[PDB]
Coordinates of C-alpha atoms in Angstrom, one line a residue:
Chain A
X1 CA -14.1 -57.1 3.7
X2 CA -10.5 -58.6 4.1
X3 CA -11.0 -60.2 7.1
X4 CA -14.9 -61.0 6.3
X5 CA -14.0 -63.2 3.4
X6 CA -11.8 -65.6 5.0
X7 CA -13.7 -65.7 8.0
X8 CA -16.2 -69.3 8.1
X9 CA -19.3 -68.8 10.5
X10 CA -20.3 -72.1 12.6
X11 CA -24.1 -72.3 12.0
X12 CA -26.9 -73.3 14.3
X13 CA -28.3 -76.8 14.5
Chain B
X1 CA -22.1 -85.6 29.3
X2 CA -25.9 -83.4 29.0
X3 CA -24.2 -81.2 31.7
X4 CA -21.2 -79.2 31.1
X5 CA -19.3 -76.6 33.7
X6 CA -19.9 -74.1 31.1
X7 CA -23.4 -73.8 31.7
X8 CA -22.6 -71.2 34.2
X9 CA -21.2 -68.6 31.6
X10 CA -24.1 -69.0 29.2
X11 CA -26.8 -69.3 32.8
X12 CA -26.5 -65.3 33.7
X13 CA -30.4 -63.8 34.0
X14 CA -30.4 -60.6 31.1
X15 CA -33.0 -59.5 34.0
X16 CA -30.6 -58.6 36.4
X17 CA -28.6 -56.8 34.1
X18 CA -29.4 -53.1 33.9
X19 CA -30.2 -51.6 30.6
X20 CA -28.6 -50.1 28.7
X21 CA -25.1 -51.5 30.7
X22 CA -22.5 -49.3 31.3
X23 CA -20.1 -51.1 29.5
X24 CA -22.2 -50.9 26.5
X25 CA -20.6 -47.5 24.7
X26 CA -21.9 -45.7 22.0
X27 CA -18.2 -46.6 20.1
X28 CA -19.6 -50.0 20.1
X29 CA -23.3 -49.7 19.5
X30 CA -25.0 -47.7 16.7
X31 CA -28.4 -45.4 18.6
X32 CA -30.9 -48.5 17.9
X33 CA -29.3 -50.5 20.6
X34 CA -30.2 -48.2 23.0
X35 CA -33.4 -48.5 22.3
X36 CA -34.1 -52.0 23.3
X37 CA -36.6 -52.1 26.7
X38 CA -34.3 -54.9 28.6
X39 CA -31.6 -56.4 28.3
X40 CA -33.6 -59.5 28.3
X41 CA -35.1 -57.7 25.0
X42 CA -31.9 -57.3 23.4
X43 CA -30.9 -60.7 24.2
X44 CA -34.2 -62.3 22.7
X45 CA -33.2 -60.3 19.5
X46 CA -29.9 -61.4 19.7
X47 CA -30.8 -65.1 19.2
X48 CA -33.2 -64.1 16.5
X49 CA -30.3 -63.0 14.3
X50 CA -27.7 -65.5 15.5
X51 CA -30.3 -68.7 14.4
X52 CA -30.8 -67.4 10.7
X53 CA -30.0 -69.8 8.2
X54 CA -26.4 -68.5 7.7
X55 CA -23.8 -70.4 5.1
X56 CA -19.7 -70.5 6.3
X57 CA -19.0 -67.0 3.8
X58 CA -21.8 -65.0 5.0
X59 CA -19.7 -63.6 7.7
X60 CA -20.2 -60.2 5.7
X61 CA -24.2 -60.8 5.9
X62 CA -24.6 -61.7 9.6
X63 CA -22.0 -58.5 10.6
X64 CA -24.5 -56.6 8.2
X65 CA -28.4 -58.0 9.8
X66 CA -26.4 -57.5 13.6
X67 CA -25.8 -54.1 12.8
X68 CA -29.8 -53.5 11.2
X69 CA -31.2 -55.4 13.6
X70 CA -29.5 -55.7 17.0
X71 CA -27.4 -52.0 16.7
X72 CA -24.1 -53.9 17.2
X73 CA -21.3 -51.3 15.0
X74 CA -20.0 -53.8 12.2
X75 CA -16.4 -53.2 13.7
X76 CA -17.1 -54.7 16.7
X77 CA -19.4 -57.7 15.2
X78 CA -16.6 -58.7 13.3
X79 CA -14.4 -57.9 16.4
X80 CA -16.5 -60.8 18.1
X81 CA -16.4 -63.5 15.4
X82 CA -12.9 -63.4 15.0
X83 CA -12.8 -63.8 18.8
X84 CA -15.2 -66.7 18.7
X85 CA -13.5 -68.1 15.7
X86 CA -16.9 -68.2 14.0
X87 CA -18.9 -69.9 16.0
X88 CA -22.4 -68.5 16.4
X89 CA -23.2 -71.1 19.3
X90 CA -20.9 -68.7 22.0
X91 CA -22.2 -65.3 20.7
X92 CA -24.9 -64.9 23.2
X93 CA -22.2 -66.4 25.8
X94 CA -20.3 -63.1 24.4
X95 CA -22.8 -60.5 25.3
X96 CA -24.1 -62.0 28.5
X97 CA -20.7 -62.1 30.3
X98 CA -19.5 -58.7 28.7
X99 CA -22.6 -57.0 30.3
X100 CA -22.7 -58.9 34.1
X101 CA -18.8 -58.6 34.1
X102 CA -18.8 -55.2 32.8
X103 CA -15.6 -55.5 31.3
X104 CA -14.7 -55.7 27.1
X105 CA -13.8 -58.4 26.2
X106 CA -14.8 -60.6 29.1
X107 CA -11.4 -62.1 29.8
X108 CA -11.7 -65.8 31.1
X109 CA -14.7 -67.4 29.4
X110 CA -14.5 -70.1 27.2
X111 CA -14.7 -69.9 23.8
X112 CA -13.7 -65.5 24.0
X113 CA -10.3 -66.1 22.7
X114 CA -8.1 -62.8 24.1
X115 CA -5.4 -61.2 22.7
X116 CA -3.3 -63.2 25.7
X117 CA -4.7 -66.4 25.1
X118 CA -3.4 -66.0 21.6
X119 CA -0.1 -65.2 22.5
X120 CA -0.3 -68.1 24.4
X121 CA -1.1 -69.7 21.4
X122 CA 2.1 -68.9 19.3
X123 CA 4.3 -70.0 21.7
X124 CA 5.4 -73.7 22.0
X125 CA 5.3 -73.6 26.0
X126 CA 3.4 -76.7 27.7
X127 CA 2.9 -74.7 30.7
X128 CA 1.0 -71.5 28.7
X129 CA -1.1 -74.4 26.2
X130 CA -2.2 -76.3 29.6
X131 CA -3.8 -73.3 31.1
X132 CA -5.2 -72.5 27.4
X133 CA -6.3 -76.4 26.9
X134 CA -7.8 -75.7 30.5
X135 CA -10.0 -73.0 29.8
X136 CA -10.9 -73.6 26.3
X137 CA -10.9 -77.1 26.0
X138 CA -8.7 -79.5 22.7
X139 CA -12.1 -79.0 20.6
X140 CA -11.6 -74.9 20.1
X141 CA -7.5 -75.3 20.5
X142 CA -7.7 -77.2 17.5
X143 CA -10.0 -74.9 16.1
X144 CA -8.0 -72.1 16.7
X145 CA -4.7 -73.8 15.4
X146 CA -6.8 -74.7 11.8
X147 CA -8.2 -70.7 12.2
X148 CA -4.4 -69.4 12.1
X149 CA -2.2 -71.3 10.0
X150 CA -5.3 -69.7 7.4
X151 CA -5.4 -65.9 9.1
Chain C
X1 CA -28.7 -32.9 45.7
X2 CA -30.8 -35.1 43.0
X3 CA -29.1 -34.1 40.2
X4 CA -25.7 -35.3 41.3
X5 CA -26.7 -38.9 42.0
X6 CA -26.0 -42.1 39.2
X7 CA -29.2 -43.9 40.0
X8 CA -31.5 -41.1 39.7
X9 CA -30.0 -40.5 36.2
X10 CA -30.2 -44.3 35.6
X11 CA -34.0 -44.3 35.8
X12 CA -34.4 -40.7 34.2
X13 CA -32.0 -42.2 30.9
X14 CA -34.4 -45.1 30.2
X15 CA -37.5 -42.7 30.6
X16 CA -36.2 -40.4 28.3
X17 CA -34.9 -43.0 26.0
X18 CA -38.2 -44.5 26.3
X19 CA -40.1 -41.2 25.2
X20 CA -37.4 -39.8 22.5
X21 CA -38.5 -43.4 20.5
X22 CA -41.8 -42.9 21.1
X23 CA -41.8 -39.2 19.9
X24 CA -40.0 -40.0 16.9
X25 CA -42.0 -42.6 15.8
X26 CA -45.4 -40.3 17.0
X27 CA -45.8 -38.9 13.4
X28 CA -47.5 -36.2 15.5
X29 CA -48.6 -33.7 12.7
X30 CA -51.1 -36.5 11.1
X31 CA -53.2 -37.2 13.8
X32 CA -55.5 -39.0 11.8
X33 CA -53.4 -42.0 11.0
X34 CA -54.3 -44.0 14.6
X35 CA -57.9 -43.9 13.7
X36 CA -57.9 -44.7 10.2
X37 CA -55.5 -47.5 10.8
X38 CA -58.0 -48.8 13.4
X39 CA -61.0 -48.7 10.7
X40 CA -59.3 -50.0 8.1
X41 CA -56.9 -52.6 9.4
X42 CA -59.3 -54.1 12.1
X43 CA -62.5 -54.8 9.6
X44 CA -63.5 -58.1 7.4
X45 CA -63.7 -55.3 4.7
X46 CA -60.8 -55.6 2.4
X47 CA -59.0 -52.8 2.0
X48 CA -56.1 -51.2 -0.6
X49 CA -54.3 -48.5 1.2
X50 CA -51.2 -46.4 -0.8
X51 CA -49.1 -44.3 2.1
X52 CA -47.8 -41.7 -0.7
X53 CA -45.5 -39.1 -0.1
X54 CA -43.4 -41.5 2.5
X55 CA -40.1 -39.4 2.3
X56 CA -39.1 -39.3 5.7
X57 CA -37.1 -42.7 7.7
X58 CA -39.3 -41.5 10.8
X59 CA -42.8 -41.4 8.6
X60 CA -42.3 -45.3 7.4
X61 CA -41.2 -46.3 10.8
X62 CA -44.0 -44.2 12.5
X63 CA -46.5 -46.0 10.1
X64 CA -45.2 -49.4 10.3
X65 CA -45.4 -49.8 14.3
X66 CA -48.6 -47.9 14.2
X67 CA -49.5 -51.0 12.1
X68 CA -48.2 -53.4 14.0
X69 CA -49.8 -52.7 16.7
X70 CA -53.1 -51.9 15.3
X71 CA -53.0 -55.6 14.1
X72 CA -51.4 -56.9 17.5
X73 CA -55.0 -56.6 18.7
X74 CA -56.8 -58.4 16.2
X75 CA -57.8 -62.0 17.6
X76 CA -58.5 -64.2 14.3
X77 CA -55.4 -64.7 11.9
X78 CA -53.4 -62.6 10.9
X79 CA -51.5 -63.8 7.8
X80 CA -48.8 -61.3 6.8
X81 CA -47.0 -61.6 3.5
X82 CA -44.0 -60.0 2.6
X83 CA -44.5 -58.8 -1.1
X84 CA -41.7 -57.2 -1.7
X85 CA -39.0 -60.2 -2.9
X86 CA -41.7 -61.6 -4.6
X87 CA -42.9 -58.7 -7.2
X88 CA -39.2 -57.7 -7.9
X89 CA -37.0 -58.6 -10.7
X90 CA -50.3 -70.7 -8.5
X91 CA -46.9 -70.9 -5.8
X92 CA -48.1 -67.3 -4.0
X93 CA -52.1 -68.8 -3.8
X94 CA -50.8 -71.5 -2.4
X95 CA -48.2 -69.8 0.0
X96 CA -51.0 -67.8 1.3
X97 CA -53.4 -70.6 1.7
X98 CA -50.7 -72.5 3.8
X99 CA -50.9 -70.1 6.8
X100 CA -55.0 -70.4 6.2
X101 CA -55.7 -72.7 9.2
X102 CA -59.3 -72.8 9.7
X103 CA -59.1 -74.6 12.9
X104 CA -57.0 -71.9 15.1
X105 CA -59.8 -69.3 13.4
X106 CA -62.8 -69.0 11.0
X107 CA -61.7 -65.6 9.5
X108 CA -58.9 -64.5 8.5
X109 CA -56.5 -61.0 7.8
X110 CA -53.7 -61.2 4.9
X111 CA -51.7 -58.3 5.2
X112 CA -49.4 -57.9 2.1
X113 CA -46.5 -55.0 2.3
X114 CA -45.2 -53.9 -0.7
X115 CA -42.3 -51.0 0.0
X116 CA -41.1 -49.1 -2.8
X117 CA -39.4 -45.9 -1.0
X118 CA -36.6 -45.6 -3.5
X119 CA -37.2 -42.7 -6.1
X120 CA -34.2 -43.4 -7.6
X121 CA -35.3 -47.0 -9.1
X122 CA -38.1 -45.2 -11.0
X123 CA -38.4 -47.8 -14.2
X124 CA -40.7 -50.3 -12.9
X125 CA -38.7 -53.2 -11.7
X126 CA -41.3 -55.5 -11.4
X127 CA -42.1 -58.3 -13.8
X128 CA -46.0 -58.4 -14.9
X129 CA -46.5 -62.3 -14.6
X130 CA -45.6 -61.6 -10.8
X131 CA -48.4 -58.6 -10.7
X132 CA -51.0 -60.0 -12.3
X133 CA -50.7 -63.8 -10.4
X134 CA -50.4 -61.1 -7.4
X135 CA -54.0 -59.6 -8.8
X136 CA -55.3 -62.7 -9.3
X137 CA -54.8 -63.8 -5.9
X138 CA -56.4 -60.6 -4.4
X139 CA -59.3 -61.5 -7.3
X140 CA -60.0 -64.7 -5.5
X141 CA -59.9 -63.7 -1.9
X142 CA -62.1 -60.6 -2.3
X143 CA -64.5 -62.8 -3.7
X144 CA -64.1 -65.6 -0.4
X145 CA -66.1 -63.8 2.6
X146 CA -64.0 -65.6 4.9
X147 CA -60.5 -63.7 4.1
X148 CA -60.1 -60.0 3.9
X149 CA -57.2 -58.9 2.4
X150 CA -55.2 -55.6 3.4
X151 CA -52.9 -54.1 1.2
X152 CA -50.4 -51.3 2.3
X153 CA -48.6 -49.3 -0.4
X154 CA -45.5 -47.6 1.2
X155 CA -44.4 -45.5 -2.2
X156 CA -42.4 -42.5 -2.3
X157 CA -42.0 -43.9 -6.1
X158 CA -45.4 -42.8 -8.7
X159 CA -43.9 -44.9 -12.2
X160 CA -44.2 -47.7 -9.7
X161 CA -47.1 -46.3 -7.7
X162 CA -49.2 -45.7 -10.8
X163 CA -48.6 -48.8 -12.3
X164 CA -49.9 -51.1 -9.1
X165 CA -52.9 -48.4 -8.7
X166 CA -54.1 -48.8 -12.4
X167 CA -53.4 -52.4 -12.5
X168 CA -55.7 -52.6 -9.0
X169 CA -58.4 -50.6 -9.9
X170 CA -58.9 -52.1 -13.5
X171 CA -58.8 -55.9 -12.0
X172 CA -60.7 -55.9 -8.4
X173 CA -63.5 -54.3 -7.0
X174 CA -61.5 -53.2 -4.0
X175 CA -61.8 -49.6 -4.2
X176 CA -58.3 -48.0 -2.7
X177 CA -57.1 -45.5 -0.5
X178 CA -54.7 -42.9 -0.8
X179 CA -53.0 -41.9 2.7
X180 CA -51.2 -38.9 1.7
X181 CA -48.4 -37.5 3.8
X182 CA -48.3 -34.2 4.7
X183 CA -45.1 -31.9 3.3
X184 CA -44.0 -29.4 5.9
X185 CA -42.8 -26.3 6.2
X186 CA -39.7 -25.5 7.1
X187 CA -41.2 -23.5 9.7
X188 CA -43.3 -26.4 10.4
X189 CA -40.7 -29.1 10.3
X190 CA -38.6 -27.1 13.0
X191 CA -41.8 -26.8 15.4
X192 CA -42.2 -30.9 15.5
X193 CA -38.2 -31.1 15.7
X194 CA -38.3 -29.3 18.9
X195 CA -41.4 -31.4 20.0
X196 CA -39.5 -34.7 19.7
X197 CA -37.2 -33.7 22.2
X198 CA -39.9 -32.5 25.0
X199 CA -40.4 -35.2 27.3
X200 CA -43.3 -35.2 29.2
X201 CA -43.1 -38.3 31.2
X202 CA -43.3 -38.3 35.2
X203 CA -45.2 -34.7 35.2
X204 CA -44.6 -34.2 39.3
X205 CA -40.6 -33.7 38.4
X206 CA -38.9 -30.5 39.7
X207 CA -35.9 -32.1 37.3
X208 CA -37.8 -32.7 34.2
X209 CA -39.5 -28.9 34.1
X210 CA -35.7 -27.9 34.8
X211 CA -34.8 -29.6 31.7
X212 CA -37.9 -28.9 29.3
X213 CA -37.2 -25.1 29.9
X214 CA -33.3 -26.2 29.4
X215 CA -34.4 -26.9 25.8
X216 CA -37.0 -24.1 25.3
X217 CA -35.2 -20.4 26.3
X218 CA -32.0 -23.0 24.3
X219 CA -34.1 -23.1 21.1
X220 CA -34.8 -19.2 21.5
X221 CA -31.6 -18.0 21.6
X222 CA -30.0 -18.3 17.9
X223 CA -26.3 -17.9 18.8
X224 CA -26.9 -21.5 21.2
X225 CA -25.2 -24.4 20.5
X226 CA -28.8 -26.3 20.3
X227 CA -30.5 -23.4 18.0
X228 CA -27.2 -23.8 16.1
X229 CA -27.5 -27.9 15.5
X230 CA -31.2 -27.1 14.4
X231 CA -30.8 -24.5 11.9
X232 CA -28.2 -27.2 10.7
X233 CA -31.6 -29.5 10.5
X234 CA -32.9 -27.1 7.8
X235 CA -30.2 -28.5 5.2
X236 CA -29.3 -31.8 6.2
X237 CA -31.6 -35.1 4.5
X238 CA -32.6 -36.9 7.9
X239 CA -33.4 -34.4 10.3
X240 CA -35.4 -36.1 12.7
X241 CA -33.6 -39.3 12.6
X242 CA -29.7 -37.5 12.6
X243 CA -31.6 -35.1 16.5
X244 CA -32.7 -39.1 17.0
X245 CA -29.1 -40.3 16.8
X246 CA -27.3 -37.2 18.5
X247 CA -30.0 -36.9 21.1
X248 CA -29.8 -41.0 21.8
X249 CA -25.9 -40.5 21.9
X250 CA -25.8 -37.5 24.5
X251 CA -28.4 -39.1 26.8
X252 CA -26.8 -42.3 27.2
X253 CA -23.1 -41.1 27.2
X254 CA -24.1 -39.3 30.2
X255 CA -23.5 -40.1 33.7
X256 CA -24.7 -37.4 35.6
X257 CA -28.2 -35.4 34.8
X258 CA -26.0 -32.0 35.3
X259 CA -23.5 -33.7 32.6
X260 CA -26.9 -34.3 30.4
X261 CA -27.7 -30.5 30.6
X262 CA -24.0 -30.1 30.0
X263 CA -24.0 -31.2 27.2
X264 CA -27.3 -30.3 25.7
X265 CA -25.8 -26.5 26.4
X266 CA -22.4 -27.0 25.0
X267 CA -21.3 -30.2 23.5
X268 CA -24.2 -31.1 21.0
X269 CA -22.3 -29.8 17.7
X270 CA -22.5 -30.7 14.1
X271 CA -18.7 -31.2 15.0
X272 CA -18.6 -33.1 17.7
X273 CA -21.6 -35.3 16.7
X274 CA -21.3 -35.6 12.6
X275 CA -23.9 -37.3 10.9
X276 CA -21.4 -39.5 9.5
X277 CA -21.1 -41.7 12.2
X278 CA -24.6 -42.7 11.4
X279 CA -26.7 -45.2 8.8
X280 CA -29.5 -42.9 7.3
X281 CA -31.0 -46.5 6.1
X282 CA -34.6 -45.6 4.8
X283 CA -36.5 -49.2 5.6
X284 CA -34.7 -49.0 9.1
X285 CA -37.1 -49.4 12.5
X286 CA -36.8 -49.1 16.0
X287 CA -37.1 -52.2 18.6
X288 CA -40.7 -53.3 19.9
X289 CA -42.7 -51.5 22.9
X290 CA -42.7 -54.3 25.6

């Protein structure tokens, strides 16, 4: 949850 | 260039991985997992997930459809992405590597960042950031610097 | 000898792995069920079909791969539509007509899935307009020869289940279904408990009858750990998918078959393998067959 938030994913093309 | 000397880390056959892998522990995967028929099953799955049309926050999401889906405990899912510093691309890369190598986390492979290589990280020695610019490459070392000085 | 070896177990782990899913997702006191989804699903006819009294995980599971792979051998289109997002709280006519492609077939199957499992969200949640442009839709492709239409009710809900079989029966012509589930007795429910965990795969095993008797003169005596775990079973909400879990967890933290046996005598425990550790999630389904 804390971690989680902050956390940005790097999508597929 | 097309080619890349990373190829070999993502190449390993799920086929000649036996399923389930020893390495794969039930502290780490919920009793779905074990379910899958192959490794190559698990795998195709796997990529299924990963390729979902995901937005930067939805870290919360993807930890929640890899645990429905795939059987991968939350902890560890989000265990992974803060190892791969998000991106989705070297999650396969992950799994593949974890299984042949039978070791977790698979220690040198590019783009698993290891509790060492971080260390390595923090300190302001040329000779540690070579090795780590070496295995890594400037692309996720800049990454991982941006991924910090936030974390 | 054989029960000492690592590779021997190896292949006897993804065997038994292999039947525990399929046993679990056998919904082995309704017979019936293969059959009628065979006649029903695999027709031109359209069809309405409510599953009521889904209150088990492995009873929706069990019914949903017995679907799939009814319609896995169909041949012409199959078009399946995901109702559910849709109906909560002409763009549908046209969404179905989209994956219509009278090129790759002349007739076609729409499968729509409506799940409503939750008893909880009773009050209808569903907005009309969506139900009767849902209606209409079935209106117009009961009426096309070309497209049957197959509707599967999965309700555990009846303010919710009622209000869909009204609405249905007042608008189409469709007569439907009710697929009833059987409620078990306790008595019952303990007999088909002790089934799932029978294996009965390579039948020429001097291991495997070692193992099924294991389980049987286990299940006998009342002050074992396994008769123990089952009386348990009577009480606790999931029963077949918390022996599931356990039983997943014990085969495939074992090494040795000896160690399998080991534990099926002395470690399985409400203890040492709490239910807690596991997501009772009620739409949740097992990987594929292949």
């Amino acid at each position: 949850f804390t971690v989680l938030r902050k956390l940005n994913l790097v999508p597929i093309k | 260039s097309d080619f890349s000397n990373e190829d070999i880390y993502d190449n390993i056959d799920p086929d000649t991985i036996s399923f389930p892998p020893k390495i794969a522990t039930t502290d780490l995967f919920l009793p779905l997992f074990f379910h899958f028929g192959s490794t190559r099953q698990f795998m195709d799955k796997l990529h299924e997930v990963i390729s979902g049309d995901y937005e930067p926050s939805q870290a919360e999401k993807l930890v929640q459809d890899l645990c429905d889906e795939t059987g991968i405990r939350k902890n560890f899912s989000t265990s992974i992405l803060t190892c791969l510093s998000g991106d989705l691309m070297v999650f396969p890369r992950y799994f593949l590597n974890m299984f042949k190598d039978n070791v977790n986390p698979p220690p040198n492979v590019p783009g698993i960042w290891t509790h060492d290589d971080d260390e390595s990280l923090k300190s302001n020695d040329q000779e540690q950031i070579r090795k780590l610019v070496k295995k890594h490459g400037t692309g996720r070392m800049e990454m991982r610097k941006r991924f910090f000085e936030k974390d | 000898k054989e029960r000492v070896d690592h590779v021997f177990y190896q292949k006897f782990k993804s065997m038994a792995l292999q039947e525990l899913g399929t046993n679990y997702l056998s919904i082995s006191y309704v017979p019936s069920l293969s059959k009628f989804l065979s006649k029903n699903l695999r027709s031109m006819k359209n069809c309405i079909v409510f599953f009521d009294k889904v209150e088990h995980i492995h009873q929706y599971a069990g019914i949903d791969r017995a679907v799939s792979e009814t319609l896995s051998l169909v041949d012409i289109n199959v078009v399946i539509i995901e109702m559910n997002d849709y109906l909560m709280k002409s763009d549908l006519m046209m969404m179905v007509m989209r994956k219509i492609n009278n090129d790759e077939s002349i007739d076609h199957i729409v499968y729509f899935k409506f799940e409503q499992l939750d008893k909880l969200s009773t009050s209808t949640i569903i907005e009309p307009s969506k139900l009767t442009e849902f209606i209409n839709v079935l209106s117009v492709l009961e009426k096309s020869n070309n497209i049957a239409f197959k509707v599967l009710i999965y309700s555990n809900n009846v303010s919710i289940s009622s209000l869909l079989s009204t609405s249905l029966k007042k608008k189409l012509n469709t007569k439907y279904t009710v697929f009833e589930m059987p409620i078990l007795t306790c008595a019952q429910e303990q007999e088909y408990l002790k089934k799932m965990i029978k294996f009965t795969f390579d039948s020429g095993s001097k291991l495997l009858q070692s193992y099924n008797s294991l389980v049987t003169c286990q299940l006998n005596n009342k002050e074992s750990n396994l008769a123990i775990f089952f009386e348990f079973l009577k009480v606790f909400p999931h029963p077949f998918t918390y022996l599931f879990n356990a039983y997943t967890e014990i085969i495939v933290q074992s090494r040795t078959f000896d160690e399998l046996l080991d534990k099926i005598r002395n470690r399985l425990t409400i203890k040492n393998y709490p239910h807690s550790a596991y997501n009772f999630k009620k739409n949740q389904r097992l990987p594929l067959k292949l």
